[PDB]
Structures are given as C-alpha cells and as structure tokens.
Ligand binder design. Structure first.
Ligand SMILES: [Zn+2]
Ligand SMILES: [Zn+2]
Lengths: 21, 30, 30, 21, 21, 30, 30, 21, 21, 30, 30, 21
C-alpha cells in the first residue's frame, strides 16, 4: 500500500525500507 | 485531475534505489 | 564499467507504464 | 529475466507485456 | 489537443495511439 | 499554481515510447 | 546494442523545454 | 536530423534552437 | 530563491539564466 | 500535502540543462 | 559518443533526493 | 568530482552522502 501512504505523505525511510525484498 | 499516475512514478524511482540492486515489487491495491 | 545499474533504470520506467496502473514485480535473477 | 533480454536488446512490446500482472 | 484531454484524465492507449505519425 | 508545465512533461515521456522509434509531434493548442 | 532508443529519449526531454510551451516536431529520418 | 547530429555529439544550443516552431 | 519563485510560477528563461555559474 | 519535494525535483532537471555543461548550485532558503 | 551528458543527469536526480530537502551543489571539474 | 567516480562506478551511499551540505 505505497499509493495510499506515500502519495498522501512522504513515507519515512524505515517504512519504505520494509517494502524491499 | 491526473496526479496518482505521476505520483506512483515518483516513488518507483525512489524505491528500487533504496534496495541497492536487490529487487522489489510494486502492487498498488487496498 | 557501470551500465547494468543504469540499464535496469531505463526499463522500470518503461515497465510500470505498460501495465497502466495495475502492478508489476521486478526481480533480476538468472 | 528482463536484465538478460532487454539490456542486451530492446525486448519487443509483446515480450514485455507478459511481465505485467 | 493532448494537454486538454490527458492532463484532465489519463487518455486511453487507443486515443494516444492516434497521435503518432 | 504550476501543474500544466509538469503535466505536459509526464506525457511526452509516455508518448515517444508508444511510437517505438518512429516520430511524433507535440503541439499544445486549442 | 541498445543506445539509439535511449539516446532519442534524452533529447526529447531537452527539446520541448527549449521551446518554452510553444510546440515542436520530432521526426527521425535521413 | 537530430538523431544523426546530437546523439553523436551534443548539438549546440543554437542548432537545437532552429528545430522549435 | 528558486523554490519561492518557480514553484509558484514557472520562472522565465532569463530569470533562470541568472542562476547558472 | 507533498508538493514542494516533487516541485524542487522538476526544477533541478530543467536547471543543469540550461547551463549545458558548466555547473550550478541549488540552495533552497529565504 | 554521448554518454557523459546523460550520465550526469542520472546522478543529479539521485543526489538532491539523498539530502531530503536541504540543498546541494553540482560542479563537475577535476 | 562526481562525474569521475560515479559515472565510472555507482559510488556508494556513504561517498555520495559526503556531497550534501
Ligand atoms: Zn514528475
Ligand atoms: Zn539514461
């Protein structure tokens, strides 16, 4: 759910780090 | 009212870079 | 001799667009 | 296997169409 | 007229296909 | 209130690609 | 040996910008 | 002829200015 | 001051030319 | 309410190009 | 033999993003 | 000297971190 969390607010680096393999 | 199409293009670029040459997925869904 | 790192960035951009807002996975491996 | 098929030769649109969900 | 048709709504692939030579 | 300048840049990229190395013209006008 | 496809994409971007919101034509041919 | 002039050598700004309408 | 002049209104080419070295 | 972060990325691309190949500085401040 | 002009455009994009809205300078020289 | 270090080899994140203000 990156479109409903980063588009409304730049997600943190940690939150985006849990999306990589 | 375009915006989500260009918004998802600004993340993909700042997504594969975070990994660092490892691999990732992009599935936009609830 | 960089080239694979920039070459993989030229496809991702021309990949999510083909779908048309659906979803796709990028996993570089033999 | 997009790195070993498109980086060495622009893959066709049909071949790249079989990579989308 | 792509600025007054795609900017307000992602034009379809067929509509954008009639713009190429 | 910028938006049309960045909106026309998101199409050109997804325009020449559709052709496939053939050619296209970009003329914004009524 | 890709290179002309990615080379024509680096010009289009630096082409419509030069105009300044006027219009241009891209026809690759001898 | 931008593919056979800028791809082999960054064309000058004046040469690229004679391509706009 | 490009963020408070171009983000609110596409700055002109001359104004953006006075920002290069 | 993101917008300034993506707006500053639309200028940098249209900034180093204006120079051509000389150099430039990007310091966002009052 | 273009390549350095497109190579410096792949870094700028992946440079201002690292900062995170702070500021940076680009001066290509020995 | 980013052109003579990253263009020949993707510089590391730490090396590129010493280039920000
Ligand atoms: Zn954008
Ligand atoms: Zn490139």
């Amino acid at each position: 759910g990156i479109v409903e969390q980063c588009c409304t607010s730049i997600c943190s680096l940690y939150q985006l780090e849990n999306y990589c393999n | 009212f375009v915006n989500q199409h260009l918004c998802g293009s600004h993340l993909v670029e700042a997504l594969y870079l975070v990994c660092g040459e490892r691999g990732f997925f992009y599935t936009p869904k609830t």
